[PDB]
Design a protein around this ligand. Structure first.
Ligand SMILES: [Cu+2]
Ligand SMILES: [Cu+2]
Lengths: 655, 655
């Protein structure tokens, strides 16, 4: 297969095929299926050597995960593309892999044709001859102590559509089928003691035709707002490499994390300074809050159990991205080992972002004034996880900051509610017979920093009143306050939470350098405020399977391939065992001061559904920012042409 | 004078003149000057009666504040415009009023010509013949126990420009002159024990000509991004009344609070439902963190001591607002009693705001999909407070939410730093010989709610784990969590702070109504996270003068004219006494449950300066949101034409 331009480029359709052919041969005569075929990124050290020390081009490797009929668990390994050969392989019989769209799509037809499920539909008020009106979102079983990882299992959240164009979510059924993914048979059905038959109300729909019938008619089309860039865009791409407003970075993508930003640097007037080696979302967990059975099984780790890549929406059609867009496609392997493509998986573009900065002199009534508008570069993707959509926006700014914006939209995870049943404290009745359970949306931002070079550290920064009292010579008027910096020496020290009491922020800095003006080390500060405490209790399924979610910040030593905090194979893992973040933390004694570190940030929101969220919910925003603090010696955007600028002398001169 | 269209319209230039003429007559033969001439808004009850009960048009009143030469303090009163007569008047001899641009502009020339100040400049390294190069930002003295309110005083933060086009902030002087505003003489100069002469370095400038000399040259002009609305805008204004996407409200404006949004309602498919009666910023306080003398005097309450109206920038020229803009002008009175106008004080426009909502069905690979873009309505203003600029954005959204965005920009408040002096823990050395002190920016959002009608209440909402333990029948897997609602019965109960531990939010609801689906009362939830604790200690000047800043939330009974939390006349008030918020709180026993209430929210940021903030700082964002929760029975924006929408049947039908 042909080598890619960049060592970090995703595998090409050709590499994917080359890889699967190679694997198929190695397992000649075996009935195998492909779960994952993806780039095994080069070692950090080797990449940097290649990039800045004229070192050799790293070997082009493919990581694969396959299933073999009649064999428990999975088999994984590495394929060396240059020599078309398996160079590493092993079997993991007590593990279950990520669920692909193929894995998911087959489940619905099998429950529709299962006698037991059918009987349950009839009991629920649905004629056995109308099973084609029964639907289901096939989820991982998450984890169920009755089966462990002994069988690859899915749990089906069953719904009903009276018409194929309805939004099924207003009509959930009360039971839950457990399906053997690689046997295609229902092995058990969780049935509640309290039975609730199908809602007899009409579906809560949202397409225009439905709206016209529900309310009067649609609103008149609104006067258009057109955005044009007649002279082109200011950013430049060379393959997957981006260059914009002094930023230079590589836009990668994979089945699991979706967008992966690597080798990020800023051109400080000729001095090209590294910022991050790699940054992305490494895991998620959406824990529901009803303690009732079998709702404990609702705490999807979407990234690790489905993949933000595999689930990504093709962005072109929807008009998801406005303006002069540049797209990237994604390529994966299918069960058969053939490359599959999702067109326009990532969308890139720049847009106006308000004021960058402004200042006027009151002396001549603001005649003396300078105003510079801000423009941002946005690398985006949007993925669907059954009922919900996650809109991801990586944003680069002209003040050197990098921001991650997320918008939650889509549809509420709903369960059935009896006519006189109280949605209790665990959920909300958002429509007759519909219970939308409380749940949190937590994300794990993985940052591999290289702040102004190698050798980094992290610290918590808390605002505090001077400890001296009001009236003391040291704090006569009691207004004194400072920022207390606690730099993490050991892993244990980094396990910290956001604290509103100190308006806490965290710094990722380079202790080996010093800002010539402030005398502080150069840094990027994490300013993140939407940091929910993990509500599920210690020892809970949720807490055990997502060890990283317990703290807002987790800093561990760097090691090649420390990507996924809940383990490499998340589905059906009980949470017991030393793996993922639990393994990286170890006894918490390892050094993380002035070395190669990994910074995992947990953030997100706690969602208590309200009717406004139904039947389709308005976007809910989440954001975090990484700001350069003491990184530059002055505002880095002053050499950007102002939108307006009048000097005091010019103001005078102007009559 | 001619009556305005709307009872809430600001006084017209004609009304202002009519008012001052009337006042001048009442005080015939007296040497008086005008400090404030502004609308005295009609009583809440009368306005509502006029608006919805066919009641009489309220009397058109003007509130005034004047100074009389040789008389201590001020005189204030009300003028009935219809009968051109003073209907209420009184003298406040122990109070000092807001400082107008006129009040401020004269100070600089008086320090330049003061022998003592000159001597100090010479001592500081500035030839007495170069006083024209000496400048100063005239601040309120804030409060100084040496003079109280006995004399109207200003404190001058002295700076030096080697050229009139420089940004003086890189060159502060070490001393501080105290000036008698209404005597135009320096009465004292605070001189430090440690003397620091003028920085001999070059000014840290930021205009293009300066940048070309500092770095290579400016960056090339970037390819334009043009925004056009060929068919006009979707919003409609009738005078100061706005109608947009079902929202209807009145855009008011005054010298102090700047923009004032009133009589806000949402047209819920024919049912016009009130939301807020009035919402605005009622006060601010920017407390600095150096305990050293005379820096305690730096804690400007900008809104009450200068006025977000009086300080507002004319928005046209700067290209501050992009797109098809609609402007409003502001009118005030000058010292002489003559109307003054600031053109384009408020700018209004609508723009794209990303996705409103989206959802695709994985069953046909997202062929089945609906996407609706969001557009927002923005009412904005930008004001300059000496060195800093505050960019205010009131934003209305298509999901029924209202958001307040603020962007801090402008220049750091700087003081001189000795060559070998440590900016200590109280500030940052952002440039040679420049110390930018730590400080917080706190705002007081005043909300007079009328959530779906009259009779409102407020409550804190905290997310919590079920109190039942892991393994109990009630919480077998320990994932249970709910939202604990503590509704405030008494004023005392409302004094609460944001708490990250419970991801706290506050609800303003109508206990007299119930959402037919959720069974909860209709409400607007305050989702605000940038809520710094007040760092200045209890009993401190800061804490005493800004009683409202101690808590994130303060809810008091409504009373006509309870607008300004730090009192009507803020400058030089010691903070002792029962007035403002301290008065409204009283013994904290008054009822605030299901009645007419006022909700004051304290929010903002804590700023620890970094070199990136100098010599001009990049915009720093602050935001808070009011979301309808249980207000509607379903997503209110579903009748907006989707940007794209394919039904499942249409997807099939499409080959
Ligand atoms: Cu949610
Ligand atoms: Cu600041």
């Amino acid at each position: 297969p042909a080598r890619p331009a960049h060592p970090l480029d995703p595998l090409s359709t050709a590499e994917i095929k080359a890889a699967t052919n190679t694997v198929k041969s190695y397992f000649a005569g075996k009935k195998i299926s492909f779960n994952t075929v993806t780039l095994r990124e080069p070692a950090r050290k080797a990449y940097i050597q290649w990039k800045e020390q004229g070192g050799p081009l790293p070997p082009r490797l493919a990581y694969y995960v396959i299933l073999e009929a009649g064999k428990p668990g999975v088999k994984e390994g590495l394929v060396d593309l240059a020599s078309l050969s398996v160079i590493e392989t092993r079997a993991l019989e007590t593990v279950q892999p990520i669920l692909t769209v193929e894995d998911l799509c087959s489940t619905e037809e099998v429950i529709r044709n299962d006698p037991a499920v059918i009987e349950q539909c009839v009991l629920s008020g649905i004629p056995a001859n109308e099973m084609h009106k029964v639907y289901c979102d096939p989820w991982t079983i998450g984890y169920d102590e009755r089966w462990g990882t002994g069988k690859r299992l899915q749990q089906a959240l069953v719904y009903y559509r009276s018409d194929e164009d309805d939004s099924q979510y207003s009509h959930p059924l009360d039971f839950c089928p457990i399906v053997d993914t690689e046997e295609k048979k229902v092995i058990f059905i969780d049935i509640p003691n309290r039975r609730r038959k199908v809602s007899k109300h009409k579906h809560a729909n949202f397409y225009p035709k439905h709206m016209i019938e529900k309310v009067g008619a649609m609103r008149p089309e609104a006067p258009p707002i057109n955005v044009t860039q007649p002279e082109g865009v200011s950013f430049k791409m060379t393959g997957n490499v981006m260059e914009w407003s002094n930023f230079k970075f590589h836009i990668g993508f994979n089945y699991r994390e979706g967008i992966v930003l690597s080798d990020v640097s800023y051109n400080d007037h000729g001095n090209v300074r590294p910022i991050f080696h790699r940054i992305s979302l490494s895991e998620m967990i959406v824990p529901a809050g009803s303690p009732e059975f079998p709702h404990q099984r609702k705490h999807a780790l979407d990234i690790g159990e489905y993949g933000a890549g595999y689930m990504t929406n093709p962005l072109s059609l929807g008009c998801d991205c406005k303006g002069v867009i540049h797209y990237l496609d994604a390529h994966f392997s299918d069960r058969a080992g053939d490359p599959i493509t999702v067109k326009n998986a990532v969308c890139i573009h720049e847009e106006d972002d308000g004021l960058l900065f402004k200042h006027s002199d009151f002396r001549d009534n603001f005649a003396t004034s300078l105003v510079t508008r801000a423009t941002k570069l946005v690398v985006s993707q949007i993925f669907t996880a059954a009922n919900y959509e996650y809109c991801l926006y990586w944003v680069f700014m002209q003040d050197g900051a990098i921001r991650l914006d997320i918008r939650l939209t889509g549809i509420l995870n709903t369960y059935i509610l009896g006519d006189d049943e109280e949605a209790g404290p665990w959920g909300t009745r958002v429509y007759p017979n519909v219970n939308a359970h409380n749940h949190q949306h937590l994300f794990s931002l993985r940052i591999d920093p290289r702040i102004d070079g190698d050798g980094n550290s992290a610290a918590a920064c808390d605002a505090k009143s001077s400890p001296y009292p009001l009236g003391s010579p040291e704090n006569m008027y009691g207004n004194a306050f400072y920022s207390e910096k606690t730099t993490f020496k050991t892993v244990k020290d980094s396990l910290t939470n956001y604290e509103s009491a100190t308006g806490r922020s965290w710094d990722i800095f380079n202790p080996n350098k010093v800002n010539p003006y402030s005398g502080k080390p150069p840094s990027y500060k994490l300013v993140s405020t939407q940091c929910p405490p993990l509500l599920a209790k210690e020892g809970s399924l949720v807490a055990k399977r997502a060890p990283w979610a317990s703290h807002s910040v987790n800093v561990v030593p760097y090691k090649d391939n420390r990507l996924y905090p809940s383990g490499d194979h998340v589905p059906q893992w009980s949470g017991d065992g030393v793996r993922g973040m639990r393994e990286w933390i170890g006894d918490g004694s390892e050094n993380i001061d002035n070395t190669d570190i990994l910074f995992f940030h947990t953030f997100g929101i706690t969602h208590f559904p309200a009717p406004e969220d139904f039947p389709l919910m308005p976007a809910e925003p989440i954001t975090l920012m990484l700001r350069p603090r003491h990184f530059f010696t002055e505002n880095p955007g002053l050499d950007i042409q102002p939108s307006y600028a009048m000097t005091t002398s010019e103001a005078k001169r102007a009559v």
